[PDB]
Design a protein around this ligand. Structure first.
Ligand SMILES: O=P(O)(O)OC[C@@H](O)CO
Ligand SMILES: O=P(O)(O)OC[C@@H](O)CO
Ligand SMILES: [Mg+2]
Ligand SMILES: [Mg+2]
Ligand SMILES: [Mg+2]
Lengths: 352, 340
């Protein structure tokens, strides 16, 4: 690094994986320096991915939005959102309750799930299932659909894609499913268990996240704690669930595959028109071309501990969840810096 | 003298629909001049509005003076807390104002103020305009307490906003205190700990007790200490004492010792009645964890019905109803035939 320019010093490959909320954006507004940071990497063909516990729309839709806001080209191949690894569950669960904002229905169908039911479809079917739903009539008409065989075909899993926006209904409906008789709507099992009636996946355990507001807000990790609390109260055993998203090894392994394939494309070893193969859930990449990968994040409990457990390096920024002075617990970030631009420039200068 | 205290949900009504025999039961008590109150953990509207609705649907006369709702004893708090966050359905703002609280803020008024405070609020712009108000000095006047009147209908916002108040710097909006503690930044009251209740749906639904467990779980997660909260509603002693006073006074009005013209003095919170003029009071409820254990701990008798939360065969791992019966009419007829 020299002033604003980068200068390759070695053939050793360094890569970055960026969180988005609290690192590149707050809400829909870019963080100062975020555009400059990715422009520098693009200019010098340094591989990076966006590894975010956010979600709600398709990978293409989200990267097109980011590209336009940051004035830089980000490929849909560069992003892993919280629910992206759900692509690998499509052959496992025929009918899913896809929980999230109403846009997750389209995301789930796009991934290939055979029979997607959104939680608003159950409110639509019978308002009295969710007595504390806030949905107005206009919202029910926009969000929900009549579903064939809603009450005669079992649900096979609950997949939480992102945070839904009507939690008294969302929590009631999830609880109904995981305490049902073998996943049939309108049923309740006789026997208590730590094992839910059908499996339930959460894609993000972030208790807190940084949106436009000056104070950290609860995220899906908080939602998960709430579902779990009521499950325990009804069963007397903690809920056996599945978790994906940072800091899980499941998500880091998936992300690592994506990064490896991206670098092959970036370096011209693979054509821009070659379809990308979905990584197998639970598998470590065969190779790893990177001398180091730096996770750039704002949340010690997600980004930093996730990178650390995985064996990646990490930059902790101060533009999101973390404020200087906060207890890092067992986190030892490789660098702590003000913002994403400083993260990239200081990492390249030190480690490249 | 024998008296009755009825739960409403799962005993007299499922949602807005009367349970069969409910009307006949209260008409039987009226015909025979037997005093009763409605002691409910539901709420949302003023005492008068609720009893007018019940009177209409059951074709009987129920006085506003006969009901204690979850939040009725909040009337005793009006000279304690100037500005309150009044949480619940939008009608609870009006209930609070009617009670005499001086500066009532509903949780939707904070969503109106800044949508970014509640990123997972489901409120549409039309709902915000209908439910909320333009409160003066939301950010420069401290909140004095959080009072949960009934279940609100937008829990991601409602939980986020209550969490902000109880972790704030001394009640000021847009602040977060530096030190963790089991003591919330301002006091918080819940009016109903019912984990479950019976609405029109065939399976029991979560109630405010579930909402309370959720607020407490995130408070514990941020603070490492359990939340020091206040709780009212059945089965609490605070609510039963309050109801007992109301029952006493209603019987004095039913007989004639007190004239109808007389304004009813508010029972001060936390005090037991000086007297106890009833041979027996029977609490008629559907929920063992609320109605039955409440009456039992208070020293009242009880009838558990099967038209709400309880199903034949459920374990009653603690409480012992005096009678278990099919419905409210069987509770009334069987109790009178045996204990009157
Ligand atoms: O910082 P990101 O990109 O992982 O996203 C944070 C998410 O928890 C948003 O809910
Ligand atoms: O049976 P009630 O009349 O006390 O009402 C039960 C409440 O939990 C309803 O929210
Ligand atoms: Mg973040
Ligand atoms: Mg709504
Ligand atoms: Mg009841």
């Amino acid at each position: 690094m020299i002033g604003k320019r980068f200068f390759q010093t070695t053939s050793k490959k360094i890569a970055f994986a960026f969180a988005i909320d609290g690192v590149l954006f707050r809400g829909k507004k870019p963080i100062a320096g975020a555009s400059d940071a990715l422009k520098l990497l693009n200019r010098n063909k340094i591989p990076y991915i966006l590894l975010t516990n956010g979600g709600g729309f398709s990978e293409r839709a989200r990267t097109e939005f980011i590209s336009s806001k940051l004035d830089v080209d980000v490929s849909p191949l560069q992003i892993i959102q919280s629910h992206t690894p759900y692509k690998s569950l499509v052959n496992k669960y025929s009918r899913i309750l896809a929980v999230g904002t109403p846009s997750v229905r389209g995301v789930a169908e796009g991934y290939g799930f055979q029979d997607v039911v959104h939680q608003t479809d159950i409110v639509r079917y019978n308002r009295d299932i969710a007595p504390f739903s806030g949905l107005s009539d206009e919202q029910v008409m926009e969000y929900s659909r009549d579903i064939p065989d809603l009450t005669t075909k079992k649900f096979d899993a609950v997949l939480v894609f992102n945070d839904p926006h009507d939690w008294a209904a969302d929590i009631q409906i999830i609880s109904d499913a995981i305490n049902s008789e073998n996943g049939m709507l309108n049923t309740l099992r006789n026997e208590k268990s730590g094992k839910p009636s059908i499996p339930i996946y959460f894609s993000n355990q972030d208790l807190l996240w940084a949106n436009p507001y000056k104070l950290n807000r609860f995220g899906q990790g908080a939602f998960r704690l709430l579902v779990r609390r009521l499950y325990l109260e009804l069963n007397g055993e903690p809920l056996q669930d599945y978790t994906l998203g940072k800091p899980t090894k499941l998500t880091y392994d998936f992300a690592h595959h994506v990064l490896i394939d991206w670098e092959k494309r970036l370096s011209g070893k693979i054509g821009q028109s070659v379809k990308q193969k979905l990584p197998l859930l639970g598998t470590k990449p065969s190779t790893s071309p990177f001398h180091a990968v730096f996770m750039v994040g704002d949340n010690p409990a997600s980004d930093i501990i996730g990178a650390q457990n995985y064996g990646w390096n990490s930059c902790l920024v101060k533009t999101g969840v973390y404020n200087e002075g906060d207890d890092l617990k067992e986190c030892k970030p490789t660098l702590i810096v003000n913002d994403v631009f400083d993260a990239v420039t200081k990492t390249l200068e030190k480690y490249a």
